[PDB]
Design an enzyme around this catalytic site. Sequence first.
Site, short mmCIF file in Angstrom:
data_model
loop_
_atom_site.label_atom_id
_atom_site.label_comp_id
_atom_site.label_asym_id
_atom_site.label_seq_id
_atom_site.Cartn_x
_atom_site.Cartn_y
_atom_site.Cartn_z
N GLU B 21 0.94 -1.34 -0.07
CA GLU B 21 0.05 0.08 0.03
C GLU B 21 0.93 1.41 0.12
O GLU B 21 0.40 2.27 -0.49
CB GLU B 21 -1.09 -0.09 1.18
CG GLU B 21 -2.14 -1.15 0.94
CD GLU B 21 -2.88 -1.33 2.25
OE1 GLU B 21 -2.49 -1.52 3.29
OE2 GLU B 21 -4.13 -1.71 1.85
N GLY B 88 -12.72 -4.04 1.39
CA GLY B 88 -13.81 -4.71 0.67
C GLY B 88 -15.04 -3.91 0.90
O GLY B 88 -15.42 -3.25 1.61
N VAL B 162 -12.80 -10.25 6.29
CA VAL B 162 -14.23 -10.40 6.16
C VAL B 162 -14.37 -11.41 4.70
O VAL B 162 -14.06 -11.00 3.95
CB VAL B 162 -15.22 -9.44 6.23
CG1 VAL B 162 -16.69 -9.56 5.97
CG2 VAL B 162 -15.09 -8.65 7.58
N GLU B 183 -7.91 -1.40 9.71
CA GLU B 183 -6.88 -0.63 10.42
C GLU B 183 -7.80 0.68 10.54
O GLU B 183 -7.18 1.90 11.28
CB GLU B 183 -5.83 -0.33 9.74
CG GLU B 183 -4.84 -1.76 9.73
CD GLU B 183 -5.10 -2.55 8.51
OE1 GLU B 183 -5.64 -2.01 7.53
OE2 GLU B 183 -4.73 -3.79 8.68
N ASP B 206 -12.30 -6.13 -3.45
CA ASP B 206 -12.92 -7.53 -3.12
C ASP B 206 -14.27 -7.15 -2.64
O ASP B 206 -14.54 -5.90 -2.47
CB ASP B 206 -12.47 -8.53 -2.45
CG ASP B 206 -11.99 -8.00 -0.73
OD1 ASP B 206 -11.04 -7.40 -0.62
OD2 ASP B 206 -13.07 -8.15 -0.10
C1 LIG Z 1 -3.10 -11.37 4.89
C2 LIG Z 1 -4.42 -10.73 5.00
C3 LIG Z 1 -4.63 -9.55 3.97
C4 LIG Z 1 -5.71 -8.85 4.33
C5 LIG Z 1 -5.55 -7.32 4.89
C6 LIG Z 1 -6.61 -6.42 5.11
N1 LIG Z 1 -6.62 -5.10 4.51
C7 LIG Z 1 -6.76 -4.66 5.90
O1 LIG Z 1 -5.82 -4.71 6.60
C8 LIG Z 1 -7.92 -4.34 3.58
C9 LIG Z 1 -9.09 -5.31 3.46
C10 LIG Z 1 -9.48 -5.58 1.90
N2 LIG Z 1 -10.47 -6.56 1.95
C11 LIG Z 1 -10.88 -6.84 3.25
C12 LIG Z 1 -11.72 -7.62 3.77
N3 LIG Z 1 -12.93 -8.24 3.20
N4 LIG Z 1 -11.72 -7.62 5.18
C13 LIG Z 1 -10.94 -7.19 5.96
N5 LIG Z 1 -10.00 -6.34 5.57
C14 LIG Z 1 -9.79 -6.10 3.93
#
Ligand SMILES: CCCCCCN(CO)Cc1c[nH]c2c(N)ncnc12
EC number: 3.2.2.30
Lengths: 242, 238
Positions: B21, B88, B162, B183, B206
């Site tokens: 990021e 997301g 999620v 965050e 996503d």
């Molecule tokens: C190894 C894990 C990488 C995921 C890191 C998630 N980032 C926020 O740290 C953003 C994010 C994008 N889509 C998401 C979702 N569906 N749920 C939570 N967070 C997010």
Amino acid sequence: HHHHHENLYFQGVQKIGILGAMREEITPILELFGVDFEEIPLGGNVFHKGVYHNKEIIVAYSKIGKVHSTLTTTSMILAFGVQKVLFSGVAGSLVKDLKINDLLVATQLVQHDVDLSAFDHPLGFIPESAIFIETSGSLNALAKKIANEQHIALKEGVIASGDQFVHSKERKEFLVSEFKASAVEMEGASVAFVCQKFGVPCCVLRSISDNADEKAGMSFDEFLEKSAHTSAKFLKSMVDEL
Amino acid sequence: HENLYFQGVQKIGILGAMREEITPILELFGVDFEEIPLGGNVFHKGVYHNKEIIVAYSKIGKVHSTLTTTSMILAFGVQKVLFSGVAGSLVKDLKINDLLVATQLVQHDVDLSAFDHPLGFIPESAIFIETSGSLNALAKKIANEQHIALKEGVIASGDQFVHSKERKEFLVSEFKASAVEMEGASVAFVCQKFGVPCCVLRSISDNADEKAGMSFDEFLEKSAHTSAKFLKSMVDEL
Ligand SMILES: CCCCCCN(CO)Cc1c[nH]c2c(N)ncnc12
Ligand SMILES: CCCCCCN(CO)Cc1c[nH]c2c(N)ncnc12
Ligand SMILES: [Zn+2]
């Protein structure tokens, strides 16, 4: 030790951070130390700054949960220069031998509600970190030594922390199987985590307020004050030996 | 009309959660960056338009992001914080690559209902965390001038990724959230506690459903880039 000439021995002011989550966890601490406290507001916390023997003690309650406790601990370290952090308060017992009012020291801590399993990560794990956070061996051994000398029981075990109050048989059983935790609360892991990142020795103490089952709310309400006192008493007895 | 606005040394904090990021952010500024390590983060310090800019990625989740933000504020004196990254989508009108700024944020995994508190609420705090009306107004003006869409909405943050319909629906019903990440809430919270204007900017990666893992993996780079470009164009105008 006997000091015949006090001017020959070191008198520098050691800075110690003392944390609770709630006001009620630190009220007993303020009283037991029994000295005057300057109150300093910062980042929405009140820091209680006093002098006690060779030591500058900085006392605050963080407010509940990981964010609160992460912020406050980082403020103690960065704004008040504390060289050690001791946490005192209450927790929920997850094991039969940890009874109401009993004491424990966290050998390790985990954030039990962290879930990155969607990318195959074990529960509690985050990339560029670890599942289990360590605490100070020095302070933990000091803790066992005072416990043994005062003839009071002290468990040492894993403490699980998350941003939910645990009050059901199913979440309890999860914490035991997943993490082999002996108790549960909402700040421990975060405080220990911050200290580890800044290289600041950290000891986490808790007295059991409930059993983290469906009764926990009521038991917590009944035993908060006593359990808080029992933890604060033991923390002071640690600080006296520091 | 510079003389009428603040005349002192400006310092601006710029945060992502993951290295992916901030890489595009660093590249976009193009200036030289001093690396300064502190509390397990590396802060990238540079100068642009005669403001100090401090760039770091926090690492994932509430504890990481809270620590990093507090360090930025207390150790580097940053006067504003702009967060860039991905998130997301919880709403039909927000599709892959689309930008949003958080009007308010919430910590969605906080649960003190055992004492009859509403979900997301902690005593001596609030369910909803505010951000800077002015920074957000700036984002919206810039968006319209660049002729790109920019939704304003509630962002839900928690220490879980999620990827299920159920949790999606909980987030929409309980908080009326438009997007989810891990965050934003904690960053905005710390900034609030310290009186520091905060803007939380996200590009959609996503749909936070059972496909979310794969979508995130495929679209992380581009979504991060989109967010980073937009953050740059905000800094350009500060
Ligand atoms: C190894 C894990 C990488 C995921 C890191 C998630 N980032 C926020 O740290 C953003 C994010 C994008 N889509 C998401 C979702 N569906 N749920 C939570 N967070 C997010
Ligand atoms: C609205 C009032 C809330 C009480 C706060 C509970 N503290 C929070 O740090 C510790 C704690 C004691 N027992 C617990 C349990 N069973 N689960 C989680 N945390 C705990
Ligand atoms: Zn691919």
